[PDB]
C-alpha cells in the first residue's frame, strides 16, 4: 500500500555478474542495517566465472558496493593415500545468501568436488559449499556437508544408496533464531533431495583452511529413501523455518519439493529430526508447486501461516484453454495441534508466462494496521512483461484477494525484476518496514522505502 515508488534507491554491480540473484538485510553488532547481495556469475582470479558477494551500506542514492572477499582458489590435499580436489570454477558463489546476527552465509551450490585414489575416483560432481563470514572481525569458515571420500566403484556395488555427490548444498538456505544453519540440497541422494543442518557456532569452531574434509559432530542430515515418489523431487529446492507444533522450544522446517511424485510437486513441514508433520500436495503437474515457500502470521492470531508459490500453474480459461500465469496458495494454521486444511486463499497471476509466485517475501506490517503483509513477484509479469511485484495486506480472515499496491519494474526487459525478494526490515529507521527487490538480469537491486499511509 504505502511503499514509495517515486524515489527508489539503486545498487549495481559488474556487467554480467547476475548481481541481485539473491539478497538479504544484514545487521552488524551495532545494529546498522546493510544489504548483502550475491552475484553468482562474478569473475574470479582466473578471469573465470566463480561468483561473488557484496555488502552494500545503506545510502539513499545507492551506487556501487564493496565486495565481501572469499577464497576463490582451487584446493588440493594429498592425505590418506588419496587426493582431494575442490573446483570453484562456475560454482555460482552467491546463488543464495542469508544473514543471521553479525554473520553472513553465502553459498556456491555448483562448486565441484572429487577424490582420486590411484586409478579410481569418486567422480567430479557438484556437492556445493557455503562460505561463512563475520565482516567486522574478518573471521571466515566453510561448510560442505556432502563431500565424501568414497570411490565411484562403491556407490555402484551398492545401488547408489546415500549418494550425496550431487547435493548442490546451499541451493537454498535459512537460519533459525538459535543460529542453526539449514541448507537445501535438491540433488542429494541421487536427486531425491536432502537437508543439512548444523549450528553456525560449531561450523566456525571446527573449520580450518586446507583440511577440506572435517567432522561437525552436531550436524544433522535428512535421510535417504527407496520411495519412488521422492525420486527426482528436488526436496530442498526451497526451505524456510517456523512454528507449527505449539512447542516453542522446537523449531519446525518447511521444505519445498517442486517435482515430488512425478512433477506433482509438494511441500512438507518437519520437526528438527526431519519427522514429517504435514505434507501439502501440488494441484497441477509441472506447475512447480513448492518453488518458493514463506512463513509469516498474516491473520494476526499469533500462529505462523504458510505460503507456497507455483510459478508455472496454468489457469483454466474459456473454451478448454489453459494459460500459464502462476499461483500462490495460503494455508492458515489452525488453533491447537490440528492439521492444516485446504488452501484458505488462492492467488492467481494475470500475465501469461509472468510466473506469479516465483518469490514470496513477508513484509512485516507494512501499513501498521496490525496484520503482517506479503509481497509476491512475477518476474516476467505486468502488461509489458518486464516484471512486477504485488503487495497483499493481511486481514483477520487471511489476506486480501486484490493487491494493495503494484510495483512495476524500473529496469528493461529481461531483468528478472523480483526473482529475489526481502522485506520486514526498517533500513532507513523511519518506523516502517522496507522492501529490497533483486533484478539479476540487470545486475541491480532496488530498494523501496515504506512511507506513512496517505
Amino acid at each position, epitope marked *: 500500500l504505502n511503499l514509495d515508488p517515486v524515489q527508489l534507491t539503486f545498487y549495481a554491480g559488474p556487467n554480467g555478474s547476475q548481481f541481485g540473484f539473491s539478497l538479504d538485510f544484514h545487521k552488524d553488532s551495532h545494529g546498522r542495517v546493510a544489504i548483502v547481495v550475491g552475484a553468482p556469475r562474478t569473475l574470479g582470479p582466473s578471469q573465470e566465472e566463480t561468483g561473488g558477494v557484496f555488502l552494500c551500506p545503506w545510502r539513499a542514492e545507492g551506487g556501487q558496493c564493496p565486495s565481501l572477499l572469499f577464497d576463490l582458489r582451487d584446493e588440493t590435499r594429498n*592425505v590418506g593415500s588419496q587426493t582431494l580436489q575442490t573446483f570453484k570454477a562456475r560454482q555460482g558463489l552467491g546463488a543464495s545468501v542469508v544473514s543471521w546476527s553479525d554473520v553472513i552465509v553465502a553459498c556456491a551450490p555448483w562448486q565441484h568436488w572429487n577424490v582420486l585414489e590411484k586409478t579410481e575416483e569418486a567422480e567430479k560432481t557438484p556437492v556445493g559449499s557455503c562460505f561463512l563470514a563475520q565482516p567486522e572481525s574478518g573471521r571466515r569458515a566453510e561448510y560442505s556437508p556432502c563431500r565424501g571420500n568414497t570411490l565411484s566403484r562403491i556407490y555402484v556395488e551398492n545401488d547408489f544408496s546415500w549418494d550425496k555427490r550431487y547435493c548442490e548444498a546451499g541451493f537454498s538456505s535459512v537460519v533459525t533464531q538459535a543460529g542453526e544453519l539449514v541448507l537445501g540440497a535438491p540433488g542429494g541422494y541421487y536427486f531425491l533431495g536432502l537437508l543439512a543442518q548444523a549450528p553456525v557456532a560449531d561450523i566456525f569452531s571446527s573449520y580450518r583452511p586446507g583440511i577440506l574434509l572435517w567432522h561437525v559432530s552436531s550436524q544433522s542430515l535428512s535421510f535417504d529413501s527407496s520411495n519412488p515418489e521422492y525420486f527426482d523431487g528436488y526436496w530442498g529446492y526451497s526451505v524456510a523455518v517456523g512454528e507449527f507444533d505449539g512447542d516453542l522450544n522446537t523449531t519446525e522446517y518447511v521444505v519445498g519439493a517442486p517435482t515430488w511424485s512425478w512433477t506433482l510437486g509438494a511441500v512438507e513441514i518437519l520437526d528438527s529430526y526431519y519427522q514429517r508433520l504435514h505434507r501439502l500436495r501440488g494441484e497441477q503437474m509441472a506447475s512447480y508447486f513448492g518453488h518458493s515457500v514463506a512463513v509469516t502470521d498474516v491473520n494476526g492470531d499469533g500462529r505462523h501461516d504458510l505460503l507456497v508459490g507455483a510459478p508455472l500453474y496454468m489457469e483454466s480459461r474459456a473454451d478448454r484453454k489453459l494459460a500459464e500465469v502462476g499461483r500462490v496458495y495460503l494455508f492458515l494454521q489452525p488453533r491447537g495441534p490440528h492439521a492444516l486444511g485446504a488452501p484458505s486463499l488462492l492467488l492467481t497471476g494475470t500475465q501469461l508466462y509472468g510466473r506469479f509466485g516465483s518469490a514470496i517475501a513477508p513484509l512485516g506490517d507494512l501499513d501498521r494496521d496490525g496484520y503482517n503483509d506479503i509481497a509476491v513477484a512475477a518476474p516476467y509479469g505486468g502488461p509489458s512483461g518486464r516484471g512486477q511485484v504485488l503487495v497483499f495486506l493481511g486481514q483477520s480472515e487471511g489476506l486480501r484477494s486484490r493487491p494493495s499496491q503494484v510495483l512495476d519494474s524500473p529496469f528493461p526487459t529481461g531483468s528478472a525484476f523480483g526473482f529475489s525478494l526481502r522485506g520486514a526490515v526498517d533500513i532507513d529507521d523511519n518506523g516502517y518496514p522496507d522492501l529490497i527487490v533483486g533484478a539479476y538480469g540487470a545486475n541491480q537491486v532496488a530498494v523501496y522505502r515504506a512511507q506513512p499511509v496517505v
Partner: antibody
Amino acid sequence: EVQLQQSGAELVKPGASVKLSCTASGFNIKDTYVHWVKQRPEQGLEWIGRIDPANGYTKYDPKFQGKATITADTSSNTAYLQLSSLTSEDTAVYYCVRPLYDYYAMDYWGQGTSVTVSS
Amino acid sequence: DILMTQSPSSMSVSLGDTVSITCHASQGISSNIGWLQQKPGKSFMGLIYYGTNLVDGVPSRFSGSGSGADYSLTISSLDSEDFADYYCVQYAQLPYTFGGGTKLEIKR
C-alpha cells in the same frame, strides 16, 4: 565429552586368541574412523589399521594382515580388535584412536589395553 | 611406508625454557602431520593436527610448524606437566607411521 573406554587388561596363552573392545562414550561410534595402535617399549608405536564403523570397510598395515581383525557394532556402540595366533611379540599395549575434526587425524585416544602372552 | 625420523631422543631442560622438536619424513607430506603427548604412566593426548592447528583444550604455548618433509613442535615456557613423551605421526600415506619419540627430562 569424547571418551574411549577400552576393555580391561588381558592375559592369555601363546597360540590363543583375544578380542579387545573400545566402547564409545559421549558420541556415536558411527561418526568417525576408528584406528588401532600398538605400543612396545623398544619398537615404539606401530599403526595396525582403521575401520569405518558406518559401513565396516577396513584398512591394515601389511605387517598385521592375518593377525589383526578389526570389527565394529553400532548397536552396542563399540569397536573391536581381535588378535589370533598370539606370540611374545604380540605383548604390548593397544589403543583405539579417532580424530577430532580432520577426517584423517589421530587426536582422541583411549586409555589403552595391556596384553601379556605367556604360558 | 614413510619413515619418521624424530630428533632428538631426549633432552634435559629446565622450566621456562623454549624447546623445539624436529621430525623429518622420508618424503614430503604437505603438513599432514600430528603431534602427541603421553604423560608418564598415562595414555596419549592430541596436541597438533594438520601441522599447525591445535587440538581443543591444548594451551597456546604449544605450536607446530614446518613444511615439505621437515617439521617442528615448539613449547614456549616449559611447565611442570610438559615433562613427558612426545611423538610425531604422519597420515599423508597409508600405513600411518610414527616417530621414534622424544622424552623431556628435568635438568639438574
